[PDB]
């Protein structure tokens, strides 16, 4: 049982097992206590598991948000640093609201940011949107893309239907069966 990773996260260890089980190799989630989690694989599956590590860029970085490097603890805050923290909380709250729709499994929303208009002589421009979504299969997914643009339409000041782009897709095949141990 050769070791692969250690010092991981609870969600980072639940991600390493989920990629290898897609590719017909088993794993063991041995807990180390206060260090974290550690993954040890078998010896004939060592060459294949190393190859899937380089491709998927594992271990996963923590997902970044824009309001993580402009913290609200400072005594002074610029207006450039105050619209970006407001906008960074709407696209997270809109993501929590998008998963409660009928059929959406996951989504990600981006909004066009405004930087220079705080100090430049221009009034602020219109807002542009972009959305992704993953649907459960069996869904007629050509008609679902007009119900998200209507919800996203009057979530801003004045946007058109050309500045919102929805690219959605049905989910992948199910992985349900066990990999199977090598007979040694």
């Amino acid at each position: 049982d050769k070791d692969l990773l250690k010092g991981l996260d609870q969600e980072q260890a639940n991600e390493v097992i989920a990629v290898l089980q897609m590719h017909n190799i088993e794993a063991n989630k041995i807990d180390s206590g206060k260090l974290g989690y550690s993954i040890t694989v078998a010896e004939p599956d060592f060459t294949a598991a190393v190859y899937w590590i380089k491709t998927y860029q594992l271990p996963p970085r923590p997902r970044v948000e824009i309001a993580q490097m402009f913290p609200a603890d400072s005594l002074v805050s610029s207006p450039r640093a105050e619209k970006a923290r407001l906008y960074s909380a709407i696209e997270q709250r809109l993501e929590q609201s998008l998963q409660t729709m009928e059929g959406v499994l996951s989504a990600r929303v981006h909004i066009s940011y405004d930087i220079d208009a705080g100090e430049n002589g221009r009034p602020p421009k219109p807002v542009h949107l972009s959305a992704l979504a993953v649907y459960e299969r069996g869904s007629p997914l050509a008609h679902q893309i007009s119900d998200i643009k209507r919800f996203l339409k009057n979530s801003f000041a004045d946007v058109d239907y050309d500045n919102i782009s929805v690219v959605l897709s049905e989910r992948s095949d199910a992985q349900l069966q066990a990999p199977g141990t090598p007979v040694k």
């Binding site: 590719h23 190799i25 004939p44 050509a142 095949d173 069966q177 199977g180 090598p182 007979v183």
Partner: protein, 222 residues
């Protein structure tokens, strides 16, 4: 330990075929189940010999042999629904081989695939392959443009399409590339910034004149 027990629990997504060169062929259905079976023969829990075939690459393995010994041949795709009798879709109006030298090709295609028993040859028509691509492109109401030339046609989908016009066009082509392949007809989905979706006109003294199709488009100020 036999072969179909060392694979997964569901013994119906794969299909084990006996070979003729003393080998054993497993028939997967997609690229995900292909890596499922190749991990078994790579980790080494099987004593005898085994190979993995696939629809998208066995159509490539005997097209590399085919464009060396039989050039200038017009065909579309080989379908592998029953692997003991494949079907070869030739062109009728572009192939000029007689019956005697078409039976030599079936016995020569038999030597490339040791799992097959007999390759079936039928002569598909050439305008039916263009009529299904045209009537299927008008049915989705997509602004297209046809360019007819000798030895294959091509359809260009220009313009600034929105998300529904991309999703309907991308979905029809992949359900069409599966049937006929991309040897004859090629699709040309591209996004440019013009609100006029592909067409072009010049205007003088009588109205508008539809220009000949070219590559340059006028960028739209609106």
């Amino acid at each position: 330990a036999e072969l179909d027990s060392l694979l997964g629990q569901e013994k119906e997504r794969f299909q084990v075929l006996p070979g003729r060169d003393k080998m054993l062929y497993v028939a997967a259905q997609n690229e995900r189940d292909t890596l499922w079976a190749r991990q078994v023969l790579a980790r080494g829990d099987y004593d005898k010999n085994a190979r993995v075939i696939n629809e998208n690459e066995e159509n490539k393995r005997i097209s590399i042999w085919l464009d060396t010994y039989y050039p200038q041949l017009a065909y579309y795709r080989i379908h592998f629904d029953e692997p003991r009798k494949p079907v070869f879709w030739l062109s009728r109006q572009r192939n000029t081989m007689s019956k005697k030298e078409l039976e030599v090709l079936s016995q020569k295609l038999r030597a490339l695939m040791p799992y097959a028993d007999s390759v079936n040859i039928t002569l598909m028509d050439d305008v039916t392959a263009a009529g299904q691509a045209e009537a299927g492109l008008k049915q989705q109401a997509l602004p297209y443009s046809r360019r007819n030339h000798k030895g294959g046609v091509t359809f260009v989908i220009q313009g600034a399409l929105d998300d529904v016009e991309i999703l309907r066009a991308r979905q029809f082509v992949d359900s069409y590339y599966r049937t006929w392949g991309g040897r004859y007809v090629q699709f040309a989905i591209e996004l440019k910034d013009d609100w006029l979706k592909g067409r072009s006109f010049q205007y003088g003294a009588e109205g508008y004149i539809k220009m000949s199709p070219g590559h340059w488009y006028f960028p739209s100020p609106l």
